[PDB]
Amino acid sequence: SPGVVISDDGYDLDLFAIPNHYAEDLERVFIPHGLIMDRTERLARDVMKEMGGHHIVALCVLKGGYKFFADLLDYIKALNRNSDRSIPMTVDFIRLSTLTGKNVLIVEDIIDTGKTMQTLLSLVRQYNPKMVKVASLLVKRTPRSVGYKPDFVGFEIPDKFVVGYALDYNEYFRDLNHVAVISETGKAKYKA
Amino acid sequence: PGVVISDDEPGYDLDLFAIPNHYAEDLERVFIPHGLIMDRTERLARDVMKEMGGHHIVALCVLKGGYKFFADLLDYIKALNRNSDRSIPMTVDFIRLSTLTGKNVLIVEDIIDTGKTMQTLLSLVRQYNPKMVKVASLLVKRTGYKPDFVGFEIPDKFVVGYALDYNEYFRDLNHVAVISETGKAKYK
Amino acid sequence: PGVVISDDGYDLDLFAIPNHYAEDLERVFIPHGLIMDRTERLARDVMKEMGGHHIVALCVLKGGYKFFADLLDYIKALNRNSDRSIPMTVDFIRLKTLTGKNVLIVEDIIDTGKTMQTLLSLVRQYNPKMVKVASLLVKRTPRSVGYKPDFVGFEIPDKFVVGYALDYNEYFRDLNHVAVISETGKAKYKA
Amino acid sequence: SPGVVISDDGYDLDLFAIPNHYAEDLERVFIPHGLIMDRTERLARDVMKEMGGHHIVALCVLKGGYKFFADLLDYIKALNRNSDRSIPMTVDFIRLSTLTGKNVLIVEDIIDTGKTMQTLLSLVRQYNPKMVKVASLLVKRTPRSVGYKPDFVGFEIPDKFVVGYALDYNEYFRDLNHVAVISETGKAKYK
Ligand SMILES: Nc1nc2c(ncn2C[C@@H](CO)OCCP(=O)(O)O)c(=O)[nH]1
Ligand SMILES: Nc1nc2c(ncn2C[C@@H](CO)OCCP(=O)(O)O)c(=O)[nH]1
Ligand SMILES: Nc1nc2c(ncn2C[C@@H](CO)OCCP(=O)(O)O)c(=O)[nH]1
Ligand SMILES: Nc1nc2c(ncn2C[C@@H](CO)OCCP(=O)(O)O)c(=O)[nH]1
Ligand SMILES: [Mg+2]
Ligand SMILES: [Mg+2]
Ligand SMILES: [Mg+2]
Ligand SMILES: [Mg+2]
């Protein structure tokens, strides 16, 4: 499954709640915060359906997108809360030999080209894990794609630079809970 | 007109969201996920404080149904009043009325179909001489009355989930989804 | 008797409180989150004792709608994971079809117990199958007639509380915590 | 302020929502999940008042306590969301240079002996940040303490081994949302 597909055919900024200091820094809102949560909940169910059998090593990729790792884990925890079974789980943050013979879940916020995840997978596999599966919230339909496709995808978004929820721009838009396309005004205002 | 959901867009495939297993064959598509509703409802609260709130607000919920939306909408409204340095008094009430005279009356509805409910309701409310009468409807069914505040404009399909029910079923369904012919015959 | 708050709450400066309500409160008895956690368990106690026959949830007016909405949400949450289509009736009543029904009366606060005793007397003449009362708050008061609800959220001291579901002359609705009103705020918002 | 003080002098398990597979693994619930959130919300406000405004560096200490770090930041980001000002913020993790000239906030889940923090504070202060302040969800009231006190304290708990929310035990109890006292059955089952 390609996940929730958003074609090239989001929302107007006036239809949702937006921080006033970001009003001119955004073009449109692609994915409202609540829509992310609902999809993330289903993602957690998909993961726990196949991977959630026993002990899980959930790896968060750093840096950028910790909010998605936190929310995904909460939904996963909520499922364990009603499983009639005490299930242990390892939670760590990649940027070692603990992964050997484990069910590893790599969690990423966004995959653009796919170079990051391809490098990361070719390194985790250098050890001896039972299996490595990757769950990503966002996946760009970009011509810059190397070809990689995650095992779990939340949203498939157009090839536009997005901010909000878990994605920041020079450590801005962290208080922005919606996934939104940055504008040239915001891109320039928050330049490093 | 609010968040428009056109006829040509299919909505959301049931495979993409969390749905009660007992409602699996009873739904066709998910139009509006629960989180989408809350986000839109949050903005609607801001729109209410924009045009209203200059005077004492009387929040009117209409029975039956839509109490869930009335509850959520007021929560966002009360949240806006929390960040104010002024203690805002607000009156809540439920109808099928002397309290309305000289007040800003907000009639909260979950869905508008034929529009006959609101037309009959408006006329009676403005008889009691309010300072302002406005209507907040979560859903407007594309089936000559237009609300002041609209959450979503949905196609002509019988929807259930979130505040909306069918023979008191689908109350546990948090998403606004289109009912199927199976579910229609099932819970008739 | 549910969570017991003895005569022996919290300081206002330890929680998130509306600045305009600073002088109007003495103490915070029950933070909003603590209400939610207890309400969640209450909903399970209801399903374990009333989830046998179709439930007619009756909300008592005025006040207590917020507790009614939250209680139902946790109830509906249990129905989602039941793998069964469970129909539920919701309705409202005031200071005044139920025959052979499993009726759940939802109240926010029981003080003297006169309201519920009167209500229960009225409902039982329609001859329902079962009547049970779930109250969020129950006061330890000498003015109590002796009535005890089937489901209790919190047993609180004999103090006039506001917040969450309880208002005072249409004030304190934005207050999410159950808190004791002060003489300052009570005289400030008097009608 | 010493934070919300829980005396040695908690809540019964039968009053709150608790997973069935942890039933015999717990003695008593000290802090329900919702109570934590209400307190964490106030802490975030204290933080933003005192060290907020401009740029801060949020450091989470590994391992454990990521949950409290996530929730505290959510409340912080909620504050910045309604501030009418674009506030930048660094989020980072560290396990025992960018910090220099910045407002460093160390976020801990629990402080017991205080050996972890005094060591951590000494290292961070070497890089001459503009200031270093520490927010701990739980401060364990114990004579084993070195005498260190955080700038921000959520709860001052008795000297009992607690699990839940952000405190795990051999990677168990991660699904437990309430801070509860572990039993001997659970301390041996998850050995
Ligand atoms: N804020 C923001 N950052 C982005 C975006 N696209 C790429 N990046 C850069 C980083 C952010 O984590 O991701 C690259 C993943 P890779 O191309 O597969 O190696 C974007 O739309 N928004
Ligand atoms: N569950 C469900 N109920 C509906 C729907 N359309 C109409 N109704 C009937 C009721 C529901 O509250 O509303 C009527 C509004 P009116 O025709 O303008 O007076 C629908 O799509 N779903
Ligand atoms: N806001 C507020 N109102 C209260 C309180 N105690 C009593 N009341 C009045 C009403 C309910 O609002 O109590 C009637 C229940 P009964 O005495 O058992 O018949 C209180 O602490 N706060
Ligand atoms: N699950 C649990 N773990 C604890 C507890 N007390 C200490 N620890 C261990 C670790 C944190 O997990 O404490 C280090 C802080 P320091 O002792 O001040 O240097 C406790 O009550 N529960
Ligand atoms: Mg990332
Ligand atoms: Mg209606
Ligand atoms: Mg009442
Ligand atoms: Mg720690």
CSV table of C-alpha atoms in Angstrom, one decimal, chain C:
chain,number,residue,atom,x,y,z
C,1,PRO,CA,-17.0,5.2,47.6
C,2,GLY,CA,-14.7,6.0,44.7
C,3,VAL,CA,-11.7,8.2,45.2
C,4,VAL,CA,-11.9,9.7,48.7
C,5,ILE,CA,-10.7,13.2,49.2
C,6,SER,CA,-10.6,13.5,53.0
C,7,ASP,CA,-11.1,16.8,55.0
C,8,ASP,CA,-7.4,16.5,56.0
C,9,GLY,CA,-6.9,19.1,47.2
C,10,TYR,CA,-4.0,21.1,45.7
C,11,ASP,CA,-2.4,24.5,45.8
C,12,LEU,CA,-3.5,26.8,42.9
C,13,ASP,CA,0.1,27.5,41.9
C,14,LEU,CA,0.8,23.8,41.1
C,15,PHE,CA,-1.6,23.6,38.1
C,16,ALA,CA,-2.8,25.4,35.0
C,17,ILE,CA,-5.4,27.9,36.1
C,18,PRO,CA,-7.1,30.8,34.2
C,19,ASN,CA,-5.5,34.0,35.5
C,20,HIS,CA,-8.9,35.7,35.7
C,21,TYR,CA,-10.0,33.0,38.2
C,22,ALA,CA,-6.9,33.4,40.4
C,23,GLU,CA,-8.7,35.3,43.2
C,24,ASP,CA,-11.9,33.4,42.8
C,25,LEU,CA,-10.6,30.0,44.0
C,26,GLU,CA,-9.2,28.6,47.3
C,27,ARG,CA,-7.9,25.2,46.4
C,28,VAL,CA,-8.0,22.7,43.5
C,29,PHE,CA,-9.6,19.4,44.5
C,30,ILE,CA,-9.6,17.4,41.3
C,31,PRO,CA,-7.4,18.3,38.3
C,32,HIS,CA,-9.0,17.7,34.9
C,33,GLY,CA,-6.7,14.8,34.1
C,34,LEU,CA,-7.5,13.1,37.3
C,35,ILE,CA,-11.2,13.4,36.4
C,36,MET,CA,-10.6,11.8,33.1
C,37,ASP,CA,-8.6,8.8,34.5
C,38,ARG,CA,-11.3,8.1,37.1
C,39,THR,CA,-14.1,8.6,34.5
C,40,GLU,CA,-12.5,6.0,32.3
C,41,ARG,CA,-12.6,3.4,35.1
C,42,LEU,CA,-16.2,4.4,35.9
C,43,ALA,CA,-17.2,3.6,32.3
C,44,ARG,CA,-15.8,0.1,32.7
C,45,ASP,CA,-17.7,-0.3,36.0
C,46,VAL,CA,-20.8,0.6,34.2
C,47,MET,CA,-20.2,-1.8,31.3
C,48,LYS,CA,-19.5,-4.6,33.8
C,49,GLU,CA,-22.8,-3.9,35.6
C,50,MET,CA,-25.1,-2.5,32.9
C,51,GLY,CA,-23.6,-3.8,29.7
C,52,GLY,CA,-26.1,-6.6,29.7
C,53,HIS,CA,-29.2,-4.9,28.4
C,54,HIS,CA,-29.7,-1.9,26.0
C,55,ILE,CA,-28.5,1.2,27.9
C,56,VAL,CA,-30.6,4.4,28.0
C,57,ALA,CA,-28.1,7.0,29.2
C,58,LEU,CA,-30.0,9.9,30.8
C,59,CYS,CA,-28.2,13.2,31.4
C,60,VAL,CA,-29.5,15.3,34.2
C,61,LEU,CA,-29.9,19.1,33.6
C,62,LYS,CA,-28.9,21.6,34.5
C,63,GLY,CA,-25.2,21.1,34.6
C,64,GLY,CA,-23.2,17.9,34.3
C,65,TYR,CA,-23.3,17.6,30.5
C,66,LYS,CA,-19.5,17.7,30.3
C,67,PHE,CA,-19.2,14.7,32.6
C,68,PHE,CA,-22.0,13.0,30.6
C,69,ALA,CA,-20.1,13.6,27.3
C,70,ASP,CA,-16.8,12.3,28.7
C,71,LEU,CA,-18.4,9.3,30.4
C,72,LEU,CA,-20.1,8.3,27.1
C,73,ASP,CA,-16.8,8.7,25.2
C,74,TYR,CA,-15.1,6.2,27.4
C,75,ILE,CA,-18.2,3.9,27.1
C,76,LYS,CA,-18.1,4.3,23.3
C,77,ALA,CA,-14.4,3.5,23.5
C,78,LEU,CA,-15.2,0.2,25.1
C,79,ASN,CA,-17.8,-0.6,22.5
C,80,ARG,CA,-15.3,-0.1,19.7
C,81,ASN,CA,-13.1,-2.9,21.0
C,82,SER,CA,-16.0,-5.2,21.8
C,83,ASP,CA,-16.2,-6.5,18.2
C,84,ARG,CA,-20.0,-6.2,18.4
C,85,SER,CA,-22.4,-3.5,17.2
C,86,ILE,CA,-23.7,-2.1,20.4
C,87,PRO,CA,-26.7,0.4,20.2
C,88,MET,CA,-27.1,3.0,22.9
C,89,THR,CA,-29.8,5.5,23.7
C,90,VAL,CA,-29.0,9.0,24.9
C,91,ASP,CA,-31.5,11.6,26.3
C,92,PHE,CA,-31.9,14.5,28.7
C,93,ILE,CA,-34.1,15.2,31.7
C,94,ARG,CA,-34.9,18.2,33.9
C,95,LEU,CA,-37.1,19.1,36.9
C,96,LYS,CA,-40.2,17.2,36.0
C,97,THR,CA,-40.6,4.8,26.9
C,98,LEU,CA,-38.3,3.9,29.8
C,99,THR,CA,-40.4,0.8,30.5
C,100,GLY,CA,-38.3,-2.4,30.5
C,101,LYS,CA,-35.2,-0.5,29.8
C,102,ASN,CA,-31.7,-0.5,31.4
C,103,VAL,CA,-31.5,3.1,32.4
C,104,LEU,CA,-28.2,4.9,33.4
C,105,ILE,CA,-28.7,8.2,35.1
C,106,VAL,CA,-25.7,10.5,34.9
C,107,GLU,CA,-25.2,13.2,37.5
C,108,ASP,CA,-22.3,15.6,38.1
C,109,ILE,CA,-22.7,16.1,41.9
C,110,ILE,CA,-24.8,14.7,44.7
C,111,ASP,CA,-25.1,17.0,47.7
C,112,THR,CA,-28.2,16.4,49.9
C,113,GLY,CA,-29.4,13.6,47.6
C,114,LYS,CA,-32.8,15.1,47.3
C,115,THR,CA,-32.6,15.6,43.5
C,116,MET,CA,-31.8,11.9,42.8
C,117,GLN,CA,-34.3,10.5,45.3
C,118,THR,CA,-37.0,12.6,43.6
C,119,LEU,CA,-35.8,11.7,40.1
C,120,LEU,CA,-35.5,7.9,41.0
C,121,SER,CA,-39.1,8.0,42.4
C,122,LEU,CA,-40.3,9.5,39.1
C,123,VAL,CA,-38.5,7.2,36.8
C,124,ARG,CA,-39.4,4.0,38.6
C,125,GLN,CA,-43.1,4.6,38.0
C,126,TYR,CA,-42.6,4.1,34.3
C,127,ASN,CA,-41.5,0.6,35.5
C,128,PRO,CA,-38.1,0.2,33.8
C,129,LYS,CA,-36.0,-3.0,34.0
C,130,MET,CA,-33.2,-1.4,35.9
C,131,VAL,CA,-32.2,2.1,37.1
C,132,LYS,CA,-28.6,3.0,38.2
C,133,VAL,CA,-27.1,6.4,39.0
C,134,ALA,CA,-23.6,7.4,38.2
C,135,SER,CA,-22.4,10.6,39.9
C,136,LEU,CA,-19.0,12.2,39.4
C,137,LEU,CA,-19.0,13.9,42.8
C,138,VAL,CA,-20.5,13.0,46.2
C,139,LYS,CA,-20.3,15.3,49.2
C,140,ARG,CA,-19.6,14.2,52.7
C,141,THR,CA,-22.3,16.4,54.2
C,142,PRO,CA,-24.5,16.3,57.3
C,143,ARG,CA,-27.3,17.5,55.1
C,144,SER,CA,-27.3,14.2,53.2
C,145,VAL,CA,-30.6,12.3,53.3
C,146,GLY,CA,-28.5,9.1,53.1
C,147,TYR,CA,-28.7,8.3,49.4
C,148,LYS,CA,-25.7,6.6,47.8
C,149,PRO,CA,-25.4,6.4,44.0
C,150,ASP,CA,-24.4,3.1,42.3
C,151,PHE,CA,-21.3,4.6,40.8
C,152,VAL,CA,-19.1,7.3,42.5
C,153,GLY,CA,-16.3,9.2,40.9
C,154,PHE,CA,-15.0,11.2,43.9
C,155,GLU,CA,-16.1,11.6,47.5
C,156,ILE,CA,-15.3,15.3,48.3
C,157,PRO,CA,-15.5,17.4,51.5
C,158,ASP,CA,-18.4,19.8,52.3
C,159,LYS,CA,-17.2,22.7,50.1
C,160,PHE,CA,-18.9,24.5,47.3
C,161,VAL,CA,-16.8,23.4,44.2
C,162,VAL,CA,-16.7,24.8,40.7
C,163,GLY,CA,-15.2,23.8,37.4
C,164,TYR,CA,-15.3,21.0,34.8
C,165,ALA,CA,-19.0,20.5,34.8
C,166,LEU,CA,-20.0,22.8,37.6
C,167,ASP,CA,-20.7,26.5,37.0
C,168,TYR,CA,-21.5,29.5,39.2
C,169,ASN,CA,-24.0,32.0,37.6
C,170,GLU,CA,-22.7,30.8,34.2
C,171,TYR,CA,-19.1,31.4,35.2
C,172,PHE,CA,-16.2,29.0,35.6
C,173,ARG,CA,-17.2,27.0,32.6
C,174,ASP,CA,-13.7,27.5,31.2
C,175,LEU,CA,-12.3,26.1,34.4
C,176,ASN,CA,-11.4,22.5,33.7
C,177,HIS,CA,-10.5,21.5,37.3
C,178,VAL,CA,-12.9,20.9,40.2
C,179,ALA,CA,-11.9,23.6,42.6
C,180,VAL,CA,-13.3,25.3,45.7
C,181,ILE,CA,-14.7,28.7,45.1
C,182,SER,CA,-13.6,31.6,47.3
C,183,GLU,CA,-15.7,34.2,49.0
C,184,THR,CA,-14.1,36.7,46.7
C,185,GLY,CA,-15.2,35.0,43.5
C,186,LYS,CA,-18.6,34.0,44.9
C,187,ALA,CA,-19.4,37.6,45.8
C,188,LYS,CA,-17.8,38.7,42.5
C,189,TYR,CA,-20.0,36.5,40.3
C,190,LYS,CA,-23.2,36.6,42.4
C,191,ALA,CA,-26.4,37.2,40.5
